[PDB]
Amino acid sequence: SRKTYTLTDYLKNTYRLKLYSLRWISDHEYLYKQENNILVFNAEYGNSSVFLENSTFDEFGHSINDYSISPDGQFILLEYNYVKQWRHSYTASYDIYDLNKRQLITEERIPNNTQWVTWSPVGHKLAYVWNNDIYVKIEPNLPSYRITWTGKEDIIYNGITDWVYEEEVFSAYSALWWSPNGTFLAYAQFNDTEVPLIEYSFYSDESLQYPKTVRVPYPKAGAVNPTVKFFVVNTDSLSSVTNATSIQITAPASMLIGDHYLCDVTWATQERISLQWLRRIQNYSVMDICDYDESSGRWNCLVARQHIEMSTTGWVGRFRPSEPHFTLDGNSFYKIISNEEGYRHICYFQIDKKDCTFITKGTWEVIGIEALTSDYLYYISNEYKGMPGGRNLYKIQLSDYTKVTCLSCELNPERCQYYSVSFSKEAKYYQLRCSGPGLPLYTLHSSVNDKGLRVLEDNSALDKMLQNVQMPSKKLDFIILNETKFWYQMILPPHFDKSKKYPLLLDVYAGPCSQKADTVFRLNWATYLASTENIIVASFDGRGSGYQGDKIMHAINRRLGTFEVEDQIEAARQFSKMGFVDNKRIAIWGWSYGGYVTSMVLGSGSGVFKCGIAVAPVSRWEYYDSVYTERYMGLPTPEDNLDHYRNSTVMSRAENFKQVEYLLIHGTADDNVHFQQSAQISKALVDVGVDFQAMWYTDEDHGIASSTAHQHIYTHMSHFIKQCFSLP
Amino acid sequence: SRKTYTLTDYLKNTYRLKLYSLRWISDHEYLYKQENNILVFNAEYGNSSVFLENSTFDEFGHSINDYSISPDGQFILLEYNYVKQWRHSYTASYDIYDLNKRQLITEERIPNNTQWVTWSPVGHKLAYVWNNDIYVKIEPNLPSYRITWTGKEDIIYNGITDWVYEEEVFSAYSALWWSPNGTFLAYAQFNDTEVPLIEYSFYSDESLQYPKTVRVPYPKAGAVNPTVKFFVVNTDSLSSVTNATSIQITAPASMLIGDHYLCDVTWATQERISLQWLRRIQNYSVMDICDYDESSGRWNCLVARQHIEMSTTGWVGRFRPSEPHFTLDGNSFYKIISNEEGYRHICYFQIDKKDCTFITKGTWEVIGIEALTSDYLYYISNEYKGMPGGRNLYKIQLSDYTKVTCLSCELNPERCQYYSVSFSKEAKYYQLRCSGPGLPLYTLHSSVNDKGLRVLEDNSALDKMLQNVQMPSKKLDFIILNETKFWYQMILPPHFDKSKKYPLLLDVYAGPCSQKADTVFRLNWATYLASTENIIVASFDGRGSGYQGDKIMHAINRRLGTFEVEDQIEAARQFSKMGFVDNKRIAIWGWSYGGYVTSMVLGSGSGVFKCGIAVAPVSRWEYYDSVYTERYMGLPTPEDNLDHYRNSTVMSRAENFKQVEYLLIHGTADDNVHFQQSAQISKALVDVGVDFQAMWYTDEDHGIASSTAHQHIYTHMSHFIKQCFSLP
Ligand SMILES: COc1cc2c(cc1OC)[C@@H]1C[C@H](N)[C@@H](N3C[C@@H](CF)CC3=O)CN1CC2
Ligand SMILES: COc1cc2c(cc1OC)[C@@H]1C[C@H](N)[C@@H](N3C[C@@H](CF)CC3=O)CN1CC2
């Protein structure tokens, strides 16, 4: 009788999840936006005031995209004229507003087309990047100091990342790091001079008579990478008539030997910086510890205090070497490291001592370190009930490592199994964020005795509405393969009957260190497919998946397109032998890495799958970027791993596609997984005489995320699946 | 006849048409290659010998693409290493072979990557173009003379055409014209300095890591055009000590005023050249008659012999001003011109005299002048039986214009209604070739008494095969609209039955001066659809179509995407009201201009069509090239024709596509109708939420002609049409 969850509900965001995004501003207060007011909340009591009225900036004359308020809170940055670049990068204009006065600063403004801006961590200093060069304002209404003069578009990057560093290393556009004082400004310089360029057409509005050619420095597998240098400037000693001095910190000898990456920059104290470096063969990394000399005014990284992290079985880290969390005095730190068993746990390092001490252990993994006080370290793990797809906050007493308390496990075990956390400065309070299996729940807690303070957002409005709809359910469980537990989830249609045979859609990603079987609550395409179309949407975490130790994660080493493709095939045969799937209506779809696996599955000749959809897939690893590809594959040389680079293409399997119905989709302005990749798949299918379906999205990138394109692609894909499953 | 005409019959050329391509080498002999042997034929008697044995070049080491024998029979050009550029252009390598001996010439070879080669019309002088420069050899074994020193890739073209002149004007890569003596070499020079570039990706073989960007000087509508200069060089006065001297013939004062083009080049005598020029606004053209000055070494074009061809109702010529046919003495010529009533007929021009004399008249059109003697003019018209889609050879006694013989009409009237002709030098003999309605038939005749000599190829081999296949039939008729006849054709299924109702596919082109209803015999996709799938395939020649007078052809002046679209809709409507058509199953499809019309029809909201396919369509006239577009559209300025440019796009009709099923196909390496055109169509449909089907062909151009791609596109369109029509 109830209404079902329709395609229009998903596409038009009918049932919206409520959030509670706060920004901690001290040990005891946070900011929060309510009816476009910025409010300040008191954590202990819950009382709030208005930080900045909504009626302010009504007369501004531009839509304010974002704000950033100075640490010692006298000013606010007004971000406007936002223009997106890649995943993280963008460009905007900035006004500064004097909070103690009534006024906007009208003099010595931050330029338009600024690439990145940051307040110092204390006070109100400003560092920004404009035309690839760094600038510093000591006071908001005073002239900026020019730190660098070398910045050149697409060639020299000062204080910002280039394409690969942004995407694959720092996950940020920024390459600026203030010291905790704000005295020193550390920054990276990238040089792309010999990095080859990827070129593609941008069609723009119909009024553009000639297409534009977009050109991006982008190193493909085995090509010339950018080079990096690292600098630190003393911001306290700047002159308005004399160019500033930047002291270079050079990478260790064991890196300078060949191609290498800067991997991590972490300030330890007011005068000590930590730097991680990684070799182009991502087997070997080095932590440098560099102290400032008050005498010479230089930085020195003592060779004897270098920490080395290498891997025997795979690469280093999950996607990169993990970051250190330093103790207040800067002499010791904690870092997630893979133990002797291959499970990732917290190791304790002391700076002039050689090894480290493991502080956690077991057949589970630490996801992240979240806070460190003198008495406690707070971390998230998937320990609870041996479920790799669950997430919980834990707390260790530093006086006794075996004294561990779960802080979130038993708060609401039916509703809440997937937490993240946001601590205040000094971690006097924390916000817990639950994500599933039930509706998201946001709560405020106090650290002293771990008291629940206040519920912040419980999604009761959403709960009301969803009782009027035939919601699907989710099963999360595991199967055994060669004496090993591999997890899966199923999104089961309402009124699920185990004697009826249902069509199954296999939803795949399967990238290295991925997880698609978990406990989070989602409203998405699969929700629609199960609720309205009565399709089972399964996902499975095979070899190469993350969070279950290295034996599973590193099984895929030097061998992408291999075990992770077999394990999706085998999971579907498994699901077949369960009594409720129609083994004649098994489909497969995935996006990105998911597209590659879908395509590799479809060209396998398994016979299991009737049809599949690949959206923006990798087709050949030599087409993807160097930092990512080479991490899992090594180099595409006969000396190294060429043979498997050449055996793991989608193209090589073109004949086998005559046994399946295939939908290939790609955005034309994909800067990440180039349209080229699908252009080669289709060319190979034509050459072999294999009919299939295609769809390009003009001027869309990897997300195909514009409002109209997003609605279009999901509409197109639904038709294809329904016709494949003979659904009306 | 049991077995049907299949898709695989079409795709694999199961039923090959035989041809008889001969090369006249004198008044009374021709060359003809048979297997790999070049034979020489005597026209009067029929006897023949092998001119060049297939064995001759067994040990050459390259497959030869083509041959060219010098007009004196002493030497042969061997073309190999053929690489296609655009529709007509290509590069190749050339060796010369002395025939009197039996030897390859090894010194002073024609270089690799030669862009064009031509023998003089008499003897064995060679002229060639390499790296955009002209060279001349007086003797095959001797060093070549460099004529031009200004050639520059994509900038200066000497003796070859740039993209637009090749495609739109000359239909040739060549821009060289030897005089009938071989004394003078005339040539054009093109300057693309300021012409904007179309840029698109080319992905190449799988091995290519980074796609290429192809960049072509290509003026879109209203953009900066190339400039042209004309030069004549004397080939008898060349020195291997001094640089060659090129004499410039400048355009007439009435062309020099604004942008213009070189239209036509036709030598009159050993010392007289004819030149036609056209204003960028192509309703005004000027013919210049230029004579050589023996005393000064110059060329003068007197205004007394200048002729103006202009048009009040449209543009000049069918696609360009027509070529002159001069009498031997060079003092007069014949030319196809639109008469007072707007029908195209032969005018007789005397060189220093005003006006011209129409020698033909009537409500029909001369297609071409084919040969001129002292006693007779030979031309092709559609006069016979008042059928615009028929073609016959005629003969005029020049002493009395009213005395016209039809030479081909009654030769075989049920089988043969569409002729072309090839006359020998001095026209003592002619090859007639008929193309339909029956199987092609090749015959030889002598001009003395117009006696049939010999049948050359009668396709009797194909006739027997087709006897054993269920072949469709062709209906050619007309319908009346206002008070005008508009012709159509239907390919009808075998065993057609007017009491039954058939699905109907409209096959559309409908560009200006097109004819889709003719008497030609074809084996194509439509053959398969009628024979195997029992679909009627209709084509219709409405307003804008050719060979019926300017009142019909010029209807579309300044107004593309109007009447020609309207008329196709009416045609389909009329076919509905015919008792043998199922009006719930009417489709439409077209390529290039036809894809544009298909789309405009599908976007019309007429309700007549269930589905349609557009291959490589134009979507907006500002995207197509200046020379073709401005001919019909004028300039896209507010003081010219911007409003109808803006009102005739496919994109603006996007909302209307929710009422139909649409398949859109484009090759990504289309240098002619750019992928941009379909890219914009798809974006418009997405912006408006219309589902449709798509298919790109990576690296395919306007023809989508590579054997795998050709097979793949027609397979794909066959599926689309079959499911649109509910055909199993
Ligand atoms: C936790 O931090 C990270 C998480 C993740 C990543 C990087 C991180 O930081 C380095 C990478 C970056 C990579 N570019 C992305 N891929 C794979 C490509 C298809 F094979 C297409 C594409 O966009 C996959 N994600 C997976 C999740
Ligand atoms: C008889 O000589 C000619 C015959 C023809 C033409 C030119 C001639 O002389 C130069 C033109 C040239 C034009 N480029 C071509 N189109 C139209 C475009 C679609 F809008 C895409 C495309 O390729 C259509 N053809 C039709 C036949």
Ligand SMILES: *[C@@H]1O[C@H](CO)[C@@H](O)[C@H](O)[C@H]1NC(C)=O
């Ligand atoms: C909360 O209330 C206290 C006591 O009235 C007040 O001093 C404080 O400013 C309040 N905090 C906020 C954020 O309004």
